[PDB]
């Protein structure tokens, strides 16, 4: 469906947020919050740092 890649490394400092690395691209990424998004890592659902990530075409 939708793919997204991160720019740099970040640590999800939340309860429902996951971390990802630039070399680690995830799928199923949507925008729930005007400032935050959602990321899926091989089934692992969580939050995607809109400031440290980007939605791929």
């Amino acid at each position: 469906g939708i793919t997204a890649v991160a720019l740099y490394d970040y640590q999800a400092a939340g309860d429902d947020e996951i971390s990802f690395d630039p070399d680690d691209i995830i799928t199923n990424i949507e925008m729930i919050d005007d400032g935050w998004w959602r990321g899926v890592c091989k089934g692992r659902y969580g939050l995607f740092p809109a400031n440290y990530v980007e939605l791929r075409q």
């Binding site: 720019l7 740099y8 970040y10 400092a13 939340g14 729930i32 919050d33 005007d34 400032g35 935050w36 740092p49 809109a50 400031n51 440290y52």
Partner: peptide
């Protein structure tokens, strides 16, 4: 040098106001 480090990134620690 024709190479410089990228500027500082915006606050990412922020969190939504409502789920």
């Amino acid at each position: 040098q024709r190479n410089r480090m990228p500027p500082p990134r915006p606050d990412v620690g922020s969190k939504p106001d409502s789920i």
